[PDB]
Amino acid sequence: PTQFEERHLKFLQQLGKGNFGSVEMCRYDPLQDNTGEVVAVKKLQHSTEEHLRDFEREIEILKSLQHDNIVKYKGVCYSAGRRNLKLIMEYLPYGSLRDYLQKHKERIDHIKLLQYTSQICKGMEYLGTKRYIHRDLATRNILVENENRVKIGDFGLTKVLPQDKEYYKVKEPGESPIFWYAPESLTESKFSVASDVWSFGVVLYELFTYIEKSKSPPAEFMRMIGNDKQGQSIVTHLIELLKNNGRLPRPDGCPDEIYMIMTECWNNNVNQRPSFRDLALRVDQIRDNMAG
Numbered sequence: 001p002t003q004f005e006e007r008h009l010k011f012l013q014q015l016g017k018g019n020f021g022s023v024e025m026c027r028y029d030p031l032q033d034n035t036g037e038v039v040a041v042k043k044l045q046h047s048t049e050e051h052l053r054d055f056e057r058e059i060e061i062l063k064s065l066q067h068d069n070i071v072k073y074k075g076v077c078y079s080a081g082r083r084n085l086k087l088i089m090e091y092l093p094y095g096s097l098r099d100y101l102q103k104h105k106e107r108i109d110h111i112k113l114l115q116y117t118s119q120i121c122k123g124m125e126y127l128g129t130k131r132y133i134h135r136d137l138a139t140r141n142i143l144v145e146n147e148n149r150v151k152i153g154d155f156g157l158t159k160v161l162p163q164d165k166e167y168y169k170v171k172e173p174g175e176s177p178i179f180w181y182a183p184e185s186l187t188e189s190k191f192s193v194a195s196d197v198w199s200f201g202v203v204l205y206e207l208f209t210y211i212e213k214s215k216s217p218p219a220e221f222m223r224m225i226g227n228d229k230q231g232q233s234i235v236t237h238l239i240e241l242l243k244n245n246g247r248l249p250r251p252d253g254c255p256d257e258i259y260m261i262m263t264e265c266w267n268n269n270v271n272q273r274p275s276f277r278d279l280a281l282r283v284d285q286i287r288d289n290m291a292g
């Protein structure tokens with residue numbers, strides 16, 4: 001119901017950058033009196049026909065979503081042609097859950113951690129009904145609205161399942177977050193609802209270590225690979241470690257019932273991992289049992 005144009009978009013400050021794109025804070029101001037609404041804006045640095053095509057698919061996915069725990073779509077800008085396309089989304093002042101939690105950690109207890117966990121489960125349950133696979137679940141990619149609510153973000157790798165099958169195979173892997181990936185994703189490039197469940201397991205580990213740098217997944221796995229070899233790639237060493245049942249340890253002070261959920265999510269067999277339905281019920285019941 002509304003298209004945006006270049007001449008009313010005003011730069012305020014930087015929010016982030018990668019190898020192919022960047023994000024900015026701007027004010028849309030068509031009356032030119034500085035009363036306009038503040039928004040967040042994405043654009044591409046290096047436009048290859050391939051990357052430009054992936055960008056337009058990201059936008060169609062975002063249009064179709066409406067849920068309390070998922071980030072809101074606003075519009076698009078074609079003022080300078082297809083090769084200079086921009087995306088407009090809602091601005092959330094508190095930023096990412098990774099950044100927020102490091103800052104305000106002395107006011108966040110085990111009960112609060114489980115509130116965030118529950119809301120993430122509800123969001124993924126909704127994506128499942130549309131047959132979408134997220135592919136990039138991590139605390140850097142969740143956003144905060146206020147002290148009692150969070151939403152799922154960055155949909156830049158998301159895919160749709162075929163009508164006939166229960167997995168999608170990706171042609172040409174990109175630059176990947178290997179320390180959050182399932183084994184059959186690493187060896188065969190297969191992604192599914194089940195591989196999203198392995199990733200949710202690692203998010204729960206991030207939360208109960210309070211996002212400390214020195215206990216992060218990259219730090220722990222590199223420690224476990226060791227000091228010697230010598231002769232192989234880093235990803236080759238990781239695939240071998242996982243085949244022989246090596247896993248991340250229990251965080252200091254983690255409850256029995258929460259640690260059991262982690263171990264179940266990290267099963268080698270895809271057919272033996274739990275559902276997002278059951279995960280929501282179990283988490284809510286544990287939170288109630290701490291209440292009284």
Ligand SMILES: CCc1cc(O)ccc1-c1ccc2c(C(N)=O)n[nH]c2c1
Binds near residue numbers: 023041058089094153
């Ligand atoms: C436009 C980029 C984007 C793309 C996507 O697919 C999902 C979410 C975002 C996004 C990223 C960051 C923020 C922020 C902040 N404060 O950093 N606020 N709203 C944001 C939305």
